[PDB]
Amino acid sequence: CDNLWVTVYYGVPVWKDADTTLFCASDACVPTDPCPQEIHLENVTENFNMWKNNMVEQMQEDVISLWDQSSFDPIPIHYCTPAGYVILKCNDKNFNGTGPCKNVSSVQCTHGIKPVVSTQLLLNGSLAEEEIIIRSENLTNNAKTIIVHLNKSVEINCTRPSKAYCEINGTKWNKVLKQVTEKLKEHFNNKTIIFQPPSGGDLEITMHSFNCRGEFFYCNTTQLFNNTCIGCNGTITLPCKIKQIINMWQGTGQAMYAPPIDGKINCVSNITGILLTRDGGANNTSNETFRPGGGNIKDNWRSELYKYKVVQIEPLGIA
Amino acid sequence: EVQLVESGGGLVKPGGSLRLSCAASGFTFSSYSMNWVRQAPGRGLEWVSSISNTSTYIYYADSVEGRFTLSRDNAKNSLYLQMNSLRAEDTAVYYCARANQHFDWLLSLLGGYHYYGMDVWGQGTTVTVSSASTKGPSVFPLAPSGTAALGCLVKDYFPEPVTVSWNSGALTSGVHTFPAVLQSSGLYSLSSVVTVPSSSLGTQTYICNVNHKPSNTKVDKRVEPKS
Amino acid sequence: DIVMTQSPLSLPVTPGEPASISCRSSQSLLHSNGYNYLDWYLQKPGQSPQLLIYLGSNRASGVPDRFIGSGSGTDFTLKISRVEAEDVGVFYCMQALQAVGFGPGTKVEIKRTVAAPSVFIFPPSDEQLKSGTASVVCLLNNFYPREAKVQWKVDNALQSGNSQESVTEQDSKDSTYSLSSTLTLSKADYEKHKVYACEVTHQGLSSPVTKSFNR
Ligand SMILES: *[C@@H]1O[C@H](CO[C@@H]2O[C@@H](C)[C@@H](O)[C@@H](O)[C@@H]2O)[C@@H](O[C@@H]2O[C@H](CO)[C@@H](O[C@@H]3O[C@H](CO)[C@@H](O)[C@H](O)[C@@H]3O)[C@H](O)[C@H]2NC(C)=O)[C@H](O)[C@H]1NC(C)=O
Ligand SMILES: *[C@@H]1O[C@H](CO)[C@@H](O)[C@H](O)[C@H]1NC(C)=O
Ligand SMILES: *[C@@H]1O[C@H](CO)[C@@H](O)[C@H](O)[C@H]1NC(C)=O
Ligand SMILES: *[C@@H]1O[C@H](CO)[C@@H](O)[C@H](O)[C@H]1NC(C)=O
Ligand SMILES: *[C@@H]1O[C@H](CO)[C@@H](O)[C@H](O)[C@H]1NC(C)=O
Ligand SMILES: *[C@@H]1O[C@H](CO)[C@@H](O)[C@H](O)[C@H]1NC(C)=O
Ligand SMILES: *[C@@H]1O[C@H](CO)[C@@H](O)[C@H](O)[C@H]1NC(C)=O
Ligand SMILES: *[C@@H]1O[C@H](CO)[C@@H](O)[C@H](O)[C@H]1NC(C)=O
Ligand SMILES: *[C@@H]1O[C@H](CO)[C@@H](O)[C@H](O)[C@H]1NC(C)=O
Ligand SMILES: *[C@@H]1O[C@H](CO)[C@@H](O)[C@H](O)[C@H]1NC(C)=O
Ligand SMILES: *[C@@H]1O[C@H](CO)[C@@H](O)[C@H](O)[C@H]1NC(C)=O
Ligand SMILES: *[C@@H]1O[C@H](CO)[C@@H](O)[C@H](O)[C@H]1NC(C)=O
């Protein structure tokens, strides 16, 4: 069913701003159409918002409906739009996060997005297409989330000996950390950036928590921000704990599990994004403090649904 | 009524711009799609663009996308078409015509069939694109020799048109003036001939009278048997 | 895109007996609505086009009932019962499924008891030789039908992309044609060779009878 022949929209706009019910699709969900469609709207300057979009909500609802009904491993899944409506796509290369981009086309279903459930770091995620790009709502309110969209996938190897661990090639770690340091320095009128392990609260935010094969690993990221790095350059192994019993990222309450088997339990993944936070208060100072925190899992879908925005189709649009 | 009147068109050097307009007068304008359709000299009809009753969903052709621009205001009851930048092959005779619609949902997002009834057509307006302007040298005829024929040749002129008449309007018996062509240099060139009873040669004179007006040059040429 | 074809690319008719031309797309035109998205237009010379049929078979107002549209899907057939001399035009076939597509035209003329051209040949004269080029002219006159070929041959060698041809229109009183082909040569390339000639093959010519000249 390849070929569309007529793939650009000319004339007065024909899409407003709303929000409806979009349904999952993969290969409950439906077969992803193997003939995706795209249409460019020339000389259309558009503006999107990644924090006030009524999508991350539906993603959270589908993820909860997914874990409730539940081998185990993330599945790349789309988000198709009902008839009469269309998803808009911001294809600009270096998108700040919000505001306007001037290269916008319209899909029908989004791209495959595997729902990763982790804090501090983002794994198994699409990389950006140019430089390290930062995203936040307010750059003054230090109690707001902070996303570092990287541009070099870094493999991680979390393994269980049949007190588990995670191996990471530390040289690329030091290099990507130097790059992130460069970009933060730029985004703060060239200030001295400094990092720190997370503060109080449950081990949910103090340790880097993630899911794997059914178990959950909480890692101590002590070394990953050893500022004497900026040894260090050799391959480095973070000891982590297979914490069976967690805090409910399932609504409200808790849950339980069963101890493991005498076999290798291993996840190799791609670190492709970072969740940080900020200190502040006493500033003053010639320094910028940063600890990883985030906490809220919605941020993850935020980080991966920035470019899409639902619109309602109707002719006669008015400028 | 019911009518559309076109305005615009003429010599415009390449890289330039132009504006055509269609004045609508006698129908409910804000209730029909409007379509622009050209026609090269010698070639056939070619659709150019289409725009809907609410000035939405504009379909451009291939040789027109990115260059031309179709605007509208359903109050002034006019069309407007902005041609830029121009190539030498856009030389055509442009036409505007209304057209019924039937919007559809099956063409990805939206999409109507902008054009399916073109009953009322414009008057047609010409648009030429070349370079420079010159006279029109009618460089001699010849009649080498049952019942022969001869005629004048008018080459290397610009622009259209030129008119020839034989013996200052005397002869029309089986005379043929040919539709001019466009040489690879840029100028137009045509010819004109007249079947003459062979015995009438060497007694009655045959003089061709050419009239290139955008140079105010008229010439009279004498056909001499075997020159 | 969508390719459109017509046939026959020329169809001489008679003021009286019927006629029919055909159009074929490359994709079917239905839309699950029952009626086809294809129109039929006419172009009378000098004057602007008209509209004959819209949406498959339905006839526009003002058009006589002698114009019948047929076909569905990919094959379409404009049939005309009875004709007269008001239809000497060019019948175009238009598609309206995706964007808008026209056809190549189906030129229509009158049928005429086939007559044969009287070819004439013209050298370029010393004044044009003094200028800077040389144009030799071959002429077909009072011939029918429109189909004829002119191949330029200098010293029996076949020419190529250097000749321009032009036809007239069906002459009013006789329903015949005339054609002129010009060959352009460099000022000296002319005097390089000796024998020039043109090669005509009209349909009313069993033998490609032709004309030549030296110098
Ligand atoms: C421009 O044209 C569009 C499309 O209409 C089509 O083209 C016109 C040129 C006419 O020839 C029409 O006969 C032809 O169908 C018009 O859009 C249409 O607008 C009307 C109301 O403005 C819509 O009517 C709706 O109908 C539904 C039933 O399905 C009702 O429930 C609604 O309450 C409403 O009345 C109609 O849906 C819409 N066309 C389509 C295909 O949906 C447009 O109004 C016209 N503009 C002007 C200024 O006339
Ligand atoms: C086309 O793009 C230019 C880019 O600056 C913009 O200024 C202009 O407004 C656009 N055209 C329209 C009709 O908005
Ligand atoms: C917009 O972005 C897409 C992909 O990001 C690209 O293919 C397209 O060329 C861009 N638009 C323009 C006008 O270049
Ligand atoms: C959004 O882009 C503007 C530039 O137009 C930039 O100044 C701003 O910092 C960006 N927003 C964020 C949150 O980075
Ligand atoms: C993960 O990284 C590897 C590098 O070997 C790359 O080939 C692969 O495409 C990446 N996949 C994802 C989902 O990031
Ligand atoms: C990543 O971004 C940095 C920005 O400092 C840039 O220098 C580097 O070339 C980028 N690399 C890739 C692979 O995109
Ligand atoms: C962020 O919040 C602070 C309040 O601490 C406010 O002064 C600032 O204006 C906000 N940011 C922007 C871009 O307005
Ligand atoms: C992950 O670690 C195991 C254990 O040392 C190793 O054998 C394997 O090669 C590692 N994975 C990759 C992709 O290198
Ligand atoms: C780790 O990264 C460095 C940085 O270039 C590279 O030279 C080295 O080969 C990497 N190690 C492995 C095992 O890939
Ligand atoms: C992480 O390790 C450091 C020492 O390397 C330790 O002081 C700290 O308590 C550990 N983190 C947690 C949450 O216990
Ligand atoms: C950084 O690494 C060095 C070893 O190279 C170690 O002595 C030091 O305690 C580390 N610092 C932190 C804050 O972990
Ligand atoms: C990411 O995907 C890889 C396979 O591409 C898988 O091994 C890994 O377990 C996934 N990440 C997590 C956190 O499970």
Numbering used by the authors:
A (entry chain G): 31 to 57, 73 to 115, 209 to 300, 328 to 355, 357 to 396, 409 to 497
B (entry chain H): 1 to 52, 52A, 53 to 82, 82A, 82B, 82C, 83 to 100, 100A, ...
C (entry chain L): 1 to 27, 27A, 27B, 27C, 27D, 27E, 28 to 94, 96 to 211
Text from the published report:
Env changes conformation to facilitate viral entry upon binding to CD4 on target T cells. This leads to the exposure of highly conserved CD4-inducible (CD4i) epitopes within constant region 1 and 2 (C1/C2) of gp120, known as the cluster A region, which contains non-neutralizing (as assessed using assays measuring direct neutralization) but potent ADCC epitope targets for antibodies (1–5).
To lock the N terminus in the conformation observed in the N12-i3 complex structure and, therefore, presumably the C11 conformation, we added a stabilizing disulfide bond between gp120 residues 31 and 80 (S31C and N80C). According to the same protocol for complex formation, we were able to generate a C11 Fab-gp12093TH057 (S31C, N80C) coree+N/C complex and grow crystals to diffraction quality. Surprisingly, we were not able to find the CD4 mimetic M48U1 in the structure, suggesting that the crystal lattice contacted and excluded M48U1 from binding. C11 binds almost exclusively to the gp120 inner domain β-sandwich, and slightly more than 50% of the gp120 buried surface area (BSA) is made to the N-terminal 8th β-strand of the sandwich (gp120 residues 33 to 42). The gp120 N terminus in the C11-bound conformation folds into a short β-strand (residues 37 to 39) that docks parallel to the 7th stand of the β-sandwich with the remaining portion of the N terminus, assuming a random coil restrained by the introduced C-31 to C-80 bond. Interestingly, C11 binds at the top of the β-sandwich in an orientation that also allows engagement of the gp120 C terminus. Interestingly, most of these contacts are split almost equally by 17-residue-long complementarity-determining region (CDR) H2 and 22-residue-long CDR H3 that contribute the majority of BSA to the complex (685 Å2 of 811 Å2 total buried exclusively by the heavy chain). C11, similar to the previously characterized C11-like antibody N12-i3 (5), recognizes an epitope within the 8-stranded conformation of the gp120 inner domain β-sandwich.
